[PDB]
Structures are given as C-alpha cells and as structure tokens.
Amino acid sequence: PFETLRAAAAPRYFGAALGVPHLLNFTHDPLFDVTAVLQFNGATPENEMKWAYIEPERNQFNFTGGDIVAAFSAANDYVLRGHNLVWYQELAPWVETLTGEDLWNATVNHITTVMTHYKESFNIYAWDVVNEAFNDNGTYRENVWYTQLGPDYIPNAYAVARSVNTPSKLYINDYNTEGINNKSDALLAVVQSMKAHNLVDGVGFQCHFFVGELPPDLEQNFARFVAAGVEIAVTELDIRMNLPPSQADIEQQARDYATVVNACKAQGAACVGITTWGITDLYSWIPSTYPGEGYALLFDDNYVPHPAFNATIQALLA
Ligand SMILES: *[C@@H]1O[C@H](CO)[C@@H](O[C@@H]2O[C@H](CO)[C@@H](O[C@@H]3O[C@H](CO[C@H]4O[C@H](CO[C@H]5O[C@H](CO)[C@@H](O)[C@H](O)[C@@H]5O[C@H]5O[C@H](CO)[C@@H](O)[C@H](O)[C@@H]5O)[C@@H](O)[C@H](O[C@H]5O[C@H](CO)[C@@H](O)[C@H](O)[C@@H]5O[C@H]5O[C@H](CO)[C@@H](O)[C@H](O)[C@@H]5O)[C@@H]4O)[C@@H](O)[C@H](O[C@H]4O[C@H](CO)[C@@H](O)[C@H](O)[C@@H]4O)[C@@H]3O)[C@H](O)[C@H]2NC(C)=O)[C@H](O)[C@H]1NC(C)=O
Ligand SMILES: *[C@@H]1O[C@H](CO)[C@@H](O[C@@H]2O[C@H](CO)[C@@H](O[C@@H]3O[C@H](CO[C@H]4O[C@H](CO[C@H]5O[C@H](CO)[C@@H](O)[C@H](O)[C@@H]5O)[C@@H](O)[C@H](O[C@H]5O[C@H](CO)[C@@H](O)[C@H](O)[C@@H]5O)[C@@H]4O)[C@@H](O)[C@H](O[C@H]4O[C@H](CO)[C@@H](O)[C@H](O)[C@@H]4O[C@H]4O[C@H](CO)[C@@H](O)[C@H](O)[C@@H]4O)[C@@H]3O)[C@H](O)[C@H]2NC(C)=O)[C@H](O)[C@H]1NC(C)=O
Ligand SMILES: *[C@@H]1O[C@H](CO)[C@@H](O[C@@H]2O[C@H](CO)[C@@H](O[C@@H]3O[C@H](CO)[C@@H](O)[C@H](O[C@H]4O[C@H](CO)[C@@H](O)[C@H](O)[C@@H]4O)[C@@H]3O)[C@H](O)[C@H]2NC(C)=O)[C@H](O)[C@H]1NC(C)=O
Ligand SMILES: *[C@@H]1O[C@H](CO)[C@@H](O)[C@H](O)[C@H]1NC(C)=O
Ligand SMILES: [Mg+2]
Predict the structure, then answer these.
(1) Residue 296 C-alpha to ligand 5 middle, in angstroms?
(2) What's the rounded Cα separation, in Å, for the pair 276 and 189?
(3) CB of 303 within 8 A of CB of 250?
(4) CATH topology assigned to domain 1-318
(5) Which end of the chain has fewer surrounding CB within 10 Å, N or C?
(6) Which residue's CA is the closest to the ligand 3 atom numbered 9?
(7) C-alpha R_g of the chain
(8) Is residue 300 annotated as involved in ligand binding?
(9) Which residues make Cβ contacts (< 8 Å) with residue 246, sequence separation at least 6?
C-alpha cells in the first residue's frame, strides 16, 4: 500500500505472463523474479500449458513447464490463470490431421487430463478453455475443430471442462474484441448463450494495443459483456509503439494504460483483474513479431518503470 501494482489493484489482481525460461534465469537476471514478487500477484504461463508443450505426442503429457509456473504462483499465493486448452496455434502437429470423432476424442482427453492434473495439484482460478475462436468479420474461425465438428465444438468444449468439476472459472479469450465491432458482437452472442446454459463464467480481452489507437468504445463494450452476466478480465495487455520511443508516445502510452484500467474499474466487482503480457520490454514478444516496435510493457529493458507505471498506479487508486 500503495506503491506497487499489486497493492494498488486490490481487491483486483494485477498479473503477468511468466515464462519458464525467465523464471529459471534467476541467477543471471534476478530482477525478473524479483519484480514479479514485489509488483504482481497474478500469473499466466506464457507458453508451457499450450497444447504443443503439454501434450507433445498423443496421450503423452508433459506437465513440467506448467508445473513450474504454477508452483511459483503457489509459493507467492498468486491468482493463477490456466492458458490455454483449445487454440489453433501452438498446437501439437499430431492433432491437425485427426478427423471427426477421433479429433473430438483427443480433444476431450486433452481438456480432461490437463484440468484434472491441475485440479489435484494447484489452485487454478480461471481456465482459458477456448482461445481465438472467431474471425475479425464475426464468423467462426475455420480451425480444425470447426472444420471437423462445426461451431458446436465451442460450447461442447466448455461442457467437457464443466464435467471435470474443478472450482475454476471458465473463460473464453480473444483479441480485436475489445471495442464494439463485428468480432465482439459475435463473441457476445455466443457468450450470452453459453452463460445462459451455465457453460462459461468469464470473458478475457487480450488488449494487444498500439499506442494512441485504442478502440473508441472500450468501456461501453466491457459493460455489455458484464450486463450479459459474465465477469471479465484484461488478459494480455501491452501497448506498443515505434522504436526508438518518442516523448509524445511515452506520454500517450501512460494515458492508454490508464484508459484500460478505468474501463475495468468502471465494471466494479465484475472486472476481476488485469494481466500484462510480460514484465519487462526486454523479453516482450513484440519486437520479434513487429520489427521496429516495442516499449510496450510497464518496465523497460533495465526494469526501470515506464511513466505508464505511475499512470497505472494512479488510475488503480482513483
Ligand atoms: C517436457 O517439458 C520440459 C519443460 O519444457 C522439457 O525440458 C526443457 O526442454 C528444453 C528444450 O530441450 C530445454 O531448453 C534447452 O536446454 C538446453 C540445456 O541447457 C541446460 O543445460 C546446459 C548444459 O548444462 C551442463 O553443462 C553446464 C556447464 O557446461 C553445467 O553447469 C550443467 O550443470 C550441465 O553440466 C552437466 O552436464 C554436462 C553435459 O551436458 C556434463 O559434462 C557435466 O559434468 C554435468 O553433468 C546449461 O548450459 C544450461 O544452463 C543455462 O541455463 C540455466 C537455466 O536453466 C542457467 O542457470 C545457466 O547459467 C545457463 O544460462 C545461460 O544459458 C541460457 C540459455 O540456455 C541464457 O539465456 C543465459 O543468459 C546464460 O547464458 C541449461 O541448464 C539448452 O542448451 C538449450 O539452449 C537453447 O538456446 C541455445 C542458445 O544458447 C540454442 O543454441 C539451442 O539450440 C537451444 O535452443 C535450451 O535452453 C529446457 O532446459 C528443459 N527444461 C526446462 C525446465 O525447461 C522437456 O524436454 C520435455 N520433455 C519431453 C517433451 O519429453
Ligand atoms: C537471462 O538473463 C540474461 C541477462 O544476464 C539475458 O541476456 C540478455 O538478454 C537480452 C535480451 O535478449 C539481451 O539484450 C539484447 O542485446 C542485443 C545486443 O546484444 C549484443 O550486444 C551486447 C552489448 O555489447 C556491448 O556492451 C557489452 C557490455 O555492455 C560489452 O561487453 C560488449 O563488448 C559490447 O561493447 C552484448 O552484451 C550481447 O551479449 C552477447 O554476449 C555473448 C558472449 O558474452 C554472446 O555469445 C551472445 O550472443 C550475447 O548476445 C550481444 O553481443 C540488443 O540488440 C537487443 O536490443 C533489441 O531488443 C530489445 C528487446 O530484446 C529492444 O528493447 C531493443 O530496442 C532492440 O530491439 C530493436 O532491434 C532489434 C534487433 O534485433 C529488432 O529486431 C527490434 O525489432 C528493435 O528494432 C537486446 O538489448 C542481452 O544482450 C543479454 N545479455 C547477456 C549478457 O547475454 C538472457 O536473455 C536471459 N535468458 C532468459 C531465457 O531469460
Ligand atoms: C470472413 O473472414 C474469414 C477470415 O478471413 C473468411 O473465412 C475464410 O473463408 C475461406 C473460404 O471463403 C476459407 O478457405 C477455405 O476453403 C477451402 C475449400 O476450398 C477449405 O478446404 C478450407 O478449410 C481449411 O482447412 C484445411 C484442412 O482441411 C486447410 O487446408 C486450411 O486450414 C483451410 O483453410 C477453408 O474453408 C478460410 O479458411 C476462412 N478463413 C478462416 C480464418 O476461417 C470469410 O470468408 C469471411 N466472410 C465474409 C467476408 O463474409
Ligand atoms: C460484419 O460487417 C459486415 C459489413 O461489411 C456486415 O455486412 C455483416 O452483417 C457483419 N457481420 C455480423 C455478424 O454482424
Ligand atoms: Mg494459492
């Protein structure tokens, strides 16, 4: 109280994507784990619970990576989000050639085995069961499950997740759904249905934003999901800019983080937390995905806070 993100956010959590290779780099880069403990009280595994890592061959599970992030989280009594179970990317190659009932059987076994493991071992607050199931124009993404099983795979996946009987909230997660547009409309219609049918609890908004270009009706869109009766969370926040960073963009980034915080706070108890997709710019996915862009997180390459850090603290407290 009130100098850290985690303190300022209470009773909401303020989390970070944590990668196993950075956590285990404590010797050479202690500030990563130190900043995690001092500033954050939520965590999402960056990669190692994804299908390609956790079930690399059929019915052969590898929990090592997920267990490391979960244990770090448990030691610090973080809010832990499981991420993710059904997603067209970072999918083990053997899945992509399965057809029909065979594909569905593999998927049921994936969801059930992974969730049962973490039910018995750790406290998972929420699971991103299905990730990125829609296209920008509001149609269903034609991934392998859609192609083989049709649109019903989405509620069926939540049905399977429910049958594990964990105390985890079940979330659906996506990007470009943060404003009011075709994609968020489509997501909302499906969420309204699934919520009616007791299948989903939460909606995750990734919020991979570009500085000074946030969605115009961010808060209003959050509000209509909350009106549908789900909780929401900001799940993968970063706000990127062109490098080297201009003074104007650094200042605007501060305003943009505050804008996201305020859109969350406006929902009261229904918005449970904010997670940034990483801790420091030094390991951000952005400069390797968008060359010449970066400076997107709250701490720079030397773990010195951005001006956005102060703006986030102030918005959380106010
Ligand atoms: C289930 O899921 C699991 C979890 O995901 C999977 O397990 C993970 O699998 C991945 C992929 O294979 C693996 O990542 C790779 O690891 C490679 C091994 O690196 C480690 O070991 C080497 C070698 O250590 C030996 O030698 C040193 C000294 O030379 C000694 O100190 C060691 O104790 C050890 O000695 C013993 O063995 C030798 C013979 O090997 C004997 O001669 C000796 O007598 C001893 O018996 C180390 O050098 C590495 O150390 C680095 O990282 C650790 C952190 O864990 C640091 O503490 C350490 O200081 C050092 O850090 C430096 O390197 C890192 C990058 O590695 C830098 O970031 C950092 O700045 C430092 O410079 C490890 O301990 C590794 O080689 C490989 O590297 C990749 O990147 C390089 C670029 O450098 C590329 O060129 C390569 O191609 C690779 O892509 C990569 O990181 C994970 O380690 C592994 N486990 C975990 C927990 O994630 C599992 O496979 C899966 N199972 C399935 C699917 O079945
Ligand atoms: C575990 O912890 C360790 C820390 O102990 C982590 O290692 C560090 O990892 C970071 C992130 O990858 C690296 O930062 C990057 O550095 C490169 C340049 O690196 C070269 O130059 C370094 C500086 O060299 C001078 O200065 C030193 C002393 O300061 C002198 O000793 C030298 O002689 C030079 O005068 C040098 O230190 C580097 O180290 C190399 O040394 C060993 C041998 O010792 C070599 O074998 C290795 O190859 C090792 O690299 C190296 O020579 C920068 O270019 C990077 O900046 C880009 O990326 C940033 C984000 O990552 C971004 O903010 C920047 O703006 C910039 O991005 C821009 O440019 C990109 C070009 O690629 C564009 O793609 C992009 O879009 C954008 O436009 C970055 O700063 C550290 O070098 C590294 N430190 C060490 C000591 O290794 C390690 O990663 C951790 N591991 C895990 C798993 O967490
Ligand atoms: C809204 O935008 C979406 C996304 O841009 C767009 O959806 C795309 O539609 C086209 C067809 O109009 C899909 O193209 C393919 O058509 C062939 C048949 O010729 C199918 O075999 C494809 O199936 C996929 O699966 C194959 C394995 O069996 C793979 O080879 C590959 O993954 C194929 O894509 C597929 O139906 C295209 O896949 C989709 N894209 C996505 C992301 O869903 C849609 O047309 C737009 N609607 C509008 C503008 O009204
Ligand atoms: C998406 O926008 C287009 C305009 O190009 C519109 O015709 C269509 O009805 C919209 N889709 C949905 C699902 O609202
Ligand atoms: Mg706990």
Answers:
(1) 29
(2) 27
(3) no
(4) TIM Barrel (3.20.20)
(5) N
(6) 142
(7) 19
(8) no
(9) none
Return the biggest CA–CA distance within the chain. Answer: 56
Domain range annotation of the chain: 1-318
Partner residues linked to 130 by β-bridges: 86, 172
Kindly compute the dihedral angle of the four CA atoms of residues 87, 89, 92, 93, in this order, to the nearest 10 degrees.
120
Phi, psi of 44 (to 5 degrees): -130, 130
DSSP result, the chain: --SSHHHHHTTSEEEEEE-HHHHTTTTT-HHHHHHHHHH-SEEEESSTTSHHHH-SBTTB---HHHHHHHHHHHHTTPEEEEEEEE-SSS--GGGGG--HHHHHHHHHHHHHHHHHHHHHHS--SEEEEEE--B-TTSSBP--HHHHHH-TTHHHHHHHHHHHT--SPEEEEEESS-SSSSHHHHHHHHHHHHHHHTT---EEEE--EEETT---TTHHHHHHHHHHTT-EEEEEEEEEEEESSPPHHHHHHHHHHHHHHHHHHHTTGGGEEEEEES-SBGGG-SHHHHSTTEE--SSB-TTSPBPHHHHHHHHHHH-
Does residue 267 contact residue 237 with C-beta atoms inside 8 Å? no
Nearest CA to ligand 3 atom 44: 139
Burial of 216 (0-12, 13-18, 19+ CB in 10 A): exposed
Rounded to the nearest 10 degrees, how much is the dihedral formed by the CA atoms of 14, 22, 175, 257?
40
- Ligand 1 pocket (Cβ < 6 Å) reads 20, 24-25, 27-28, 48, 56, 62, 64-65
Ligand 1 pocket test: pick from 29, 49, 62 the residue with the most ligand atoms within 8 Å of its Cβ. 62
- Nearest CA among 204, 271, 276 for reference residue 36: 276
